[PDB]
Amino acid sequence: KVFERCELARTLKRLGMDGYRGISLANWMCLAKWESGYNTRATNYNAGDRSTDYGIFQINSRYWCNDGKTPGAVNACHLSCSALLQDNIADAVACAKRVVRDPQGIRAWAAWRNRCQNRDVRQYVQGCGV
């Protein structure tokens, strides 16, 4: 599923992402936008280390979900990476919450630092009613 901006914004708020571990909703929206373009079925193979990024938040198989083919990987979210490709984003959100519970927080995603950090991210949630 490819979410429309405000539709996603409202969904994330309902799922309790606004301010989770100090991360505003606008930052989560900025992350989803640059990681997958709000697409839940997006996957990205990383030939360099043999891991794959799954779903709307492009969660990595080396540490967060199990796909079986990634060498020396763990499954901190305790989920099959398949769960991160559903149209329903409940499992992806639960896993994203787990990711930010680590000391890096939202910085765990390189894309957030490059495209979101220290920017005016208000644009991602304006007019959505959240």
Backbone as a chain_set.jsonl record, in Angstrom:
{"seq": "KVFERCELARTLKRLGMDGYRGISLANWMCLAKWESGYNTRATNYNAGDRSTDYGIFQINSRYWCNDGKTPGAVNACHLSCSALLQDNIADAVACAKRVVRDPQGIRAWAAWRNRCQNRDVRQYVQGCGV", "coords": {"N": [[0.84, -1.229, 0.0], [0.456, 2.257, -0.79], [0.56, 4.95, 1.095], [-1.296, 8.018, 1.517], [-0.164, 11.23, 2.29], [-1.489, 12.8, 4.658], [-3.246, 10.771, 5.469], [-1.498, 8.809, 6.377], [-0.292, 10.273, 8.461], [-2.406, 10.633, 10.299], [-2.85, 7.956, 10.959], [-0.426, 7.137, 12.197], [-0.469, 8.827, 14.457], [-2.67, 7.779, 15.847], [-1.635, 5.309, 16.442], [0.072, 5.914, 18.407], [2.583, 7.26, 17.955], [3.3, 9.923, 18.121], [5.587, 11.849, 19.699], [6.868, 9.659, 20.818], [9.401, 8.342, 22.718], [10.525, 10.843, 22.69], [10.281, 11.7, 20.02], [8.838, 13.631, 17.587], [5.763, 13.583, 15.69], [6.003, 14.695, 13.1], [8.673, 14.149, 12.512], [8.706, 11.373, 12.27], [7.129, 11.14, 9.998], [8.737, 12.473, 8.121], [10.849, 10.659, 8.046], [9.559, 8.229, 7.02], [8.793, 9.198, 4.508], [11.287, 9.755, 3.093], [12.464, 7.213, 3.32], [10.784, 5.186, 2.133], [8.839, 6.469, 0.604], [6.351, 6.435, 1.586], [5.513, 3.831, 1.128], [4.462, 0.622, 1.823], [5.323, -1.866, 0.77], [7.951, -1.656, -0.054], [11.284, -2.739, -0.575], [14.755, -3.123, -0.084], [17.706, -4.302, -1.178], [20.868, -4.701, 0.261], [23.659, -5.061, -1.138], [26.308, -4.82, -0.258], [26.579, -5.719, 2.504], [24.919, -7.868, 2.637], [22.277, -7.655, 3.712], [18.783, -6.727, 4.017], [16.457, -4.065, 3.622], [13.279, -3.507, 4.906], [9.855, -2.629, 4.191], [7.754, 0.322, 5.091], [9.313, 1.887, 6.891], [11.754, 1.052, 6.235], [13.237, -1.032, 7.659], [16.023, -2.746, 8.848], [17.22, -6.104, 8.226], [19.46, -7.222, 9.531], [19.538, -6.608, 12.284], [16.891, -6.15, 13.277], [14.572, -7.774, 12.188], [13.706, -11.144, 11.209], [14.846, -12.786, 8.306], [16.061, -14.993, 7.548], [18.139, -15.387, 5.498], [20.103, -13.493, 6.032], [23.389, -13.106, 7.07], [24.84, -13.664, 10.313], [22.752, -12.328, 11.762], [20.289, -10.781, 13.917], [17.102, -10.741, 15.588], [15.639, -8.452, 16.865], [13.082, -7.273, 17.035], [11.56, -9.469, 17.055], [10.141, -10.602, 14.833], [8.981, -11.853, 11.66], [10.523, -10.808, 8.72], [8.673, -10.527, 6.808], [6.342, -9.599, 7.982], [6.655, -6.914, 7.963], [5.919, -6.057, 5.474], [3.244, -5.844, 5.07], [-0.035, -4.345, 4.45], [-1.26, -3.288, 6.598], [0.121, -1.383, 9.034], [0.715, -1.903, 11.765], [2.526, -3.81, 12.965], [4.976, -2.95, 11.878], [5.185, -0.44, 13.017], [5.322, -1.085, 15.739], [7.763, -2.315, 15.719], [9.415, -0.209, 14.84], [9.245, 1.382, 17.079], [10.629, -0.182, 18.902], [13.191, -0.075, 17.695], [13.979, 2.679, 18.163], [14.229, 2.645, 20.922], [16.756, 2.069, 21.547], [19.919, 3.561, 22.387], [20.711, 5.346, 20.154], [18.341, 6.287, 19.098], [16.194, 8.019, 16.944], [18.249, 8.514, 15.212], [19.286, 6.179, 14.249], [18.588, 5.66, 11.654], [20.164, 6.51, 8.764], [19.172, 8.135, 6.743], [17.419, 9.879, 8.108], [19.167, 11.667, 9.428], [20.432, 12.926, 7.244], [18.272, 13.966, 5.614], [16.254, 15.001, 7.36], [16.986, 15.875, 10.045], [17.453, 18.853, 11.883], [15.885, 20.408, 10.182], [13.023, 22.16, 8.867], [10.433, 20.457, 9.59], [7.737, 20.626, 9.705], [6.143, 20.794, 7.446], [5.484, 18.171, 6.646], [3.27, 17.365, 8.18], [1.372, 19.392, 8.048], [-1.917, 20.671, 7.784], [-3.129, 18.189, 8.068], [-4.706, 17.684, 10.262], [-3.765, 16.681, 12.72]], "CA": [[0.0, 0.0, 0.0], [1.14, 3.543, -0.809], [-0.239, 5.877, 1.889], [-1.325, 9.418, 1.137], [0.434, 11.936, 3.432], [-2.306, 12.982, 5.852], [-3.787, 9.481, 5.872], [-0.452, 8.206, 7.189], [-0.126, 11.105, 9.653], [-3.471, 10.29, 11.229], [-2.646, 6.574, 11.383], [0.695, 7.133, 13.136], [-0.894, 9.439, 15.707], [-3.544, 6.812, 16.499], [-0.761, 4.217, 16.877], [0.898, 6.436, 19.479], [3.94, 7.63, 17.573], [3.589, 11.32, 18.419], [6.388, 12.056, 20.895], [7.412, 8.409, 21.339], [10.822, 8.46, 23.018], [10.895, 12.2, 22.323], [10.251, 11.939, 18.573], [7.594, 14.215, 17.11], [5.102, 12.936, 14.562], [6.579, 15.244, 11.873], [9.946, 13.474, 12.272], [8.37, 10.027, 11.778], [6.63, 11.351, 8.637], [9.909, 12.788, 7.321], [11.547, 9.378, 7.904], [8.806, 7.371, 6.097], [8.848, 9.822, 3.185], [12.581, 9.499, 2.468], [12.829, 5.806, 3.303], [9.994, 4.397, 1.192], [7.855, 7.244, -0.135], [5.1, 5.981, 2.215], [5.167, 2.553, 0.515], [4.656, -0.511, 2.722], [5.95, -3.037, 0.162], [9.303, -1.363, -0.493], [12.378, -3.557, -0.067], [16.011, -2.666, -0.651], [18.786, -5.229, -0.89], [22.159, -4.038, 0.461], [24.683, -5.989, -1.625], [27.524, -4.649, 0.52], [26.634, -6.522, 3.726], [23.926, -8.928, 2.472], [21.077, -7.448, 4.51], [17.718, -6.106, 3.233], [15.626, -3.1, 4.335], [11.879, -3.849, 4.653], [8.732, -1.769, 4.524], [7.585, 1.766, 5.151], [10.403, 2.531, 7.63], [12.992, 0.417, 5.757], [13.864, -1.656, 8.807], [17.068, -3.689, 8.456], [17.193, -7.502, 8.644], [20.607, -7.621, 10.349], [19.256, -6.454, 13.703], [15.492, -6.074, 13.672], [13.595, -8.794, 11.819], [14.351, -12.317, 10.645], [14.53, -13.2, 6.936], [16.812, -16.227, 7.356], [19.3, -15.33, 4.626], [21.095, -12.498, 6.417], [24.458, -13.662, 7.912], [25.029, -13.086, 11.639], [21.697, -11.388, 12.075], [19.448, -10.999, 15.083], [15.722, -10.366, 15.342], [15.237, -7.717, 18.063], [11.641, -7.044, 17.055], [10.945, -10.793, 17.12], [9.157, -10.676, 13.756], [9.468, -12.309, 10.367], [10.589, -9.567, 7.951], [7.442, -10.551, 6.019], [5.356, -8.806, 8.721], [6.934, -5.523, 7.634], [5.497, -5.795, 4.101], [1.775, -5.866, 5.059], [-0.657, -3.033, 4.246], [-1.515, -2.85, 7.963], [1.427, -1.045, 9.577], [0.832, -2.074, 13.213], [3.767, -4.507, 13.313], [6.103, -2.093, 11.489], [5.222, 0.627, 14.013], [5.785, -1.696, 16.977], [9.186, -2.555, 15.525], [10.067, 1.098, 14.779], [9.305, 1.817, 18.485], [11.728, -0.975, 19.456], [14.442, 0.488, 17.17], [14.316, 3.92, 18.844], [14.465, 2.441, 22.342], [18.216, 1.956, 21.668], [20.507, 4.898, 22.562], [20.759, 6.202, 18.967], [17.038, 6.884, 18.888], [15.841, 8.198, 15.535], [19.509, 8.592, 14.466], [19.596, 4.856, 13.723], [18.405, 5.714, 10.201], [21.045, 7.5, 8.141], [18.313, 9.056, 5.982], [16.878, 10.907, 8.996], [20.221, 12.666, 9.632], [20.646, 13.624, 5.975], [17.107, 14.677, 5.099], [15.297, 15.506, 8.345], [17.59, 16.542, 11.183], [17.66, 20.296, 11.809], [15.132, 21.034, 9.116], [11.659, 22.534, 9.198], [9.681, 19.276, 9.191], [6.317, 20.924, 9.864], [5.476, 20.555, 6.175], [5.014, 16.799, 6.549], [2.005, 17.172, 8.887], [0.472, 20.541, 7.928], [-3.225, 20.464, 7.197], [-3.625, 16.837, 8.25], [-5.595, 17.595, 11.412], [-3.152, 15.92, 13.805]], "C": [[0.864, 1.264, 0.0], [0.186, 4.526, -0.107], [-0.199, 7.29, 1.338], [-0.808, 10.075, 2.419], [-0.393, 12.058, 4.716], [-2.918, 11.692, 6.372], [-2.758, 8.808, 6.794], [-0.289, 8.943, 8.512], [-1.145, 10.734, 10.713], [-3.308, 8.891, 11.794], [-1.554, 6.478, 12.446], [0.316, 7.756, 14.488], [-1.733, 8.448, 16.513], [-2.755, 5.63, 17.085], [0.212, 4.667, 17.968], [2.331, 6.79, 19.169], [4.296, 9.07, 17.912], [4.309, 11.482, 19.765], [6.992, 10.797, 21.501], [8.923, 8.534, 21.496], [11.367, 9.815, 22.56], [10.881, 12.549, 20.85], [8.884, 12.407, 18.096], [7.064, 13.46, 15.896], [5.718, 13.401, 13.222], [7.922, 14.584, 11.502], [9.717, 12.062, 11.743], [7.899, 10.104, 10.312], [7.805, 11.627, 7.68], [10.686, 11.501, 7.026], [10.867, 8.458, 6.871], [8.876, 7.88, 4.665], [10.149, 9.505, 2.452], [13.009, 8.037, 2.434], [12.091, 4.99, 2.243], [9.004, 5.177, 0.338], [6.46, 6.798, 0.306], [4.594, 4.655, 1.626], [5.487, 1.386, 1.45], [5.34, -1.744, 2.091], [7.384, -2.827, -0.33], [10.339, -2.235, 0.212], [13.629, -3.044, -0.772], [17.098, -3.628, -0.211], [20.094, -4.45, -0.793], [23.25, -5.051, 0.125], [25.982, -5.979, -0.827], [27.674, -5.483, 1.78], [25.602, -7.66, 3.762], [22.661, -8.866, 3.329], [20.05, -6.761, 3.596], [16.904, -5.198, 4.16], [14.171, -3.392, 3.92], [10.827, -2.838, 5.073], [8.804, -0.262, 4.526], [8.717, 2.518, 5.884], [11.76, 1.949, 7.221], [13.841, -0.125, 6.902], [14.801, -2.764, 8.335], [17.036, -5.099, 9.075], [18.362, -7.974, 9.509], [20.327, -7.585, 11.85], [17.811, -6.566, 14.139], [14.451, -7.122, 13.334], [14.338, -9.977, 11.219], [13.892, -12.645, 9.231], [15.316, -14.476, 6.579], [18.079, -16.232, 6.518], [20.355, -14.305, 5.012], [22.091, -13.114, 7.403], [24.607, -12.922, 9.234], [24.01, -12.047, 12.046], [20.922, -11.781, 13.31], [18.058, -10.48, 14.72], [15.174, -9.676, 16.609], [13.753, -7.449, 18.169], [10.855, -8.347, 17.154], [9.83, -10.925, 16.083], [9.792, -11.215, 12.493], [9.533, -10.989, 9.591], [9.348, -9.414, 7.063], [6.358, -9.656, 6.653], [5.472, -7.32, 8.417], [6.56, -5.141, 6.2], [3.955, -5.811, 3.95], [1.239, -4.456, 4.816], [-0.948, -2.428, 5.629], [-0.132, -2.603, 8.571], [1.626, -1.211, 11.086], [2.131, -2.73, 13.64], [5.006, -3.681, 12.989], [6.3, -0.971, 12.51], [5.765, 0.107, 15.345], [7.289, -1.919, 16.888], [9.979, -1.234, 15.477], [10.23, 1.64, 16.213], [10.472, 1.113, 19.183], [13.068, -0.401, 18.981], [14.902, 1.746, 17.933], [14.509, 3.814, 20.353], [15.972, 2.283, 22.607], [18.737, 3.374, 21.783], [20.565, 5.865, 21.369], [19.44, 6.919, 18.706], [16.756, 6.912, 17.411], [17.081, 8.258, 14.622], [19.944, 7.262, 13.855], [19.445, 4.81, 12.203], [19.236, 6.849, 9.649], [20.25, 8.558, 7.405], [17.742, 10.173, 6.846], [17.906, 12.026, 9.204], [20.418, 13.553, 8.414], [19.491, 14.486, 5.5], [16.137, 15.302, 6.07], [15.856, 16.311, 9.507], [17.866, 18.017, 10.934], [16.957, 21.002, 10.678], [13.746, 21.355, 9.636], [10.844, 21.341, 8.687], [8.171, 19.433, 9.316], [5.516, 20.628, 8.605], [4.861, 19.161, 6.024], [3.671, 16.519, 7.234], [1.008, 18.331, 8.759], [-0.811, 20.24, 7.188], [-3.818, 19.078, 7.361], [-4.573, 16.66, 9.419], [-5.082, 16.777, 12.588], [-2.331, 16.82, 14.745]], "O": [[1.874, 1.334, 0.7], [-0.859, 4.884, -0.649], [0.804, 7.714, 0.763], [-0.993, 9.536, 3.51], [-0.033, 11.483, 5.743], [-3.092, 11.53, 7.58], [-3.11, 8.301, 7.859], [-0.162, 8.316, 9.564], [-0.801, 10.542, 11.879], [-3.591, 8.656, 12.969], [-1.733, 5.819, 13.471], [0.733, 7.267, 15.537], [-1.532, 8.294, 17.718], [-3.156, 5.035, 18.085], [1.07, 3.897, 18.4], [3.207, 6.639, 20.02], [5.477, 9.408, 17.984], [3.719, 11.28, 20.826], [7.571, 10.854, 22.586], [9.636, 8.798, 20.529], [12.506, 9.923, 22.106], [11.414, 13.588, 20.459], [7.898, 11.677, 18.188], [7.81, 12.795, 15.178], [5.926, 12.588, 12.321], [8.261, 14.475, 10.323], [10.449, 11.601, 10.867], [8.23, 9.241, 9.499], [7.857, 11.085, 6.576], [11.126, 11.28, 5.898], [11.525, 7.965, 5.955], [9.004, 7.098, 3.724], [10.119, 9.037, 1.314], [13.834, 7.658, 1.603], [12.706, 4.193, 1.534], [8.389, 4.607, -0.563], [5.517, 6.783, -0.485], [3.391, 4.39, 1.628], [6.642, 1.183, 1.824], [5.881, -2.579, 2.817], [7.964, -3.717, -0.952], [10.282, -2.441, 1.425], [13.568, -2.589, -1.914], [17.38, -3.757, 0.98], [20.397, -3.632, -1.662], [23.706, -5.801, 0.988], [26.671, -6.995, -0.729], [28.781, -5.917, 2.1], [25.435, -8.327, 4.783], [22.054, -9.893, 3.633], [20.406, -6.271, 2.524], [16.691, -5.518, 5.329], [13.872, -3.509, 2.731], [10.892, -2.264, 6.16], [9.758, 0.347, 4.041], [9.036, 3.653, 5.532], [12.79, 2.308, 7.79], [14.994, 0.264, 7.089], [14.421, -3.61, 7.526], [16.851, -5.257, 10.282], [18.266, -9.018, 10.155], [20.82, -8.429, 12.599], [17.528, -7.025, 15.246], [13.529, -7.343, 14.119], [15.475, -9.833, 10.769], [12.693, -12.77, 8.978], [15.242, -14.967, 5.453], [19.0, -17.001, 6.796], [21.41, -14.251, 4.38], [21.688, -13.596, 8.461], [24.513, -11.695, 9.276], [24.358, -11.008, 12.607], [20.894, -12.946, 13.706], [17.868, -9.859, 13.674], [14.353, -10.245, 17.329], [13.211, -7.401, 19.273], [9.634, -8.333, 17.316], [8.71, -11.313, 16.415], [10.993, -11.058, 12.274], [8.675, -10.129, 9.788], [9.019, -8.312, 6.624], [5.562, -9.037, 5.946], [4.518, -6.561, 8.588], [6.849, -4.028, 5.759], [3.438, -5.794, 2.833], [1.975, -3.48, 4.96], [-0.89, -1.211, 5.807], [0.695, -3.514, 8.618], [2.608, -0.709, 11.632], [2.778, -2.263, 14.578], [5.981, -3.705, 13.741], [7.43, -0.599, 12.829], [6.567, 0.773, 15.999], [8.007, -1.733, 17.87], [11.085, -1.156, 16.013], [11.235, 2.28, 16.522], [11.209, 1.728, 19.954], [13.989, -0.257, 19.785], [16.071, 1.859, 18.302], [14.91, 4.785, 20.996], [16.412, 2.355, 23.754], [18.076, 4.308, 21.329], [20.476, 7.078, 21.559], [19.421, 8.022, 18.159], [17.04, 5.95, 16.698], [16.973, 8.075, 13.41], [20.864, 7.223, 13.038], [20.103, 4.008, 11.539], [19.044, 8.009, 10.014], [20.6, 9.738, 7.431], [17.593, 11.3, 6.373], [17.553, 13.205, 9.161], [20.554, 14.771, 8.53], [19.698, 15.608, 5.036], [15.267, 16.068, 5.654], [15.269, 17.316, 9.909], [18.439, 18.389, 9.91], [17.38, 22.077, 10.254], [13.341, 20.889, 10.701], [10.594, 21.228, 7.487], [7.417, 18.492, 9.065], [4.345, 20.254, 8.683], [3.842, 18.995, 5.353], [3.005, 15.538, 6.903], [-0.092, 18.255, 9.308], [-0.805, 19.638, 6.115], [-4.903, 18.81, 6.846], [-5.186, 15.602, 9.563], [-5.871, 16.24, 13.366], [-1.748, 16.332, 15.713]]}, "num_chains": 1, "name": "protein.A"}
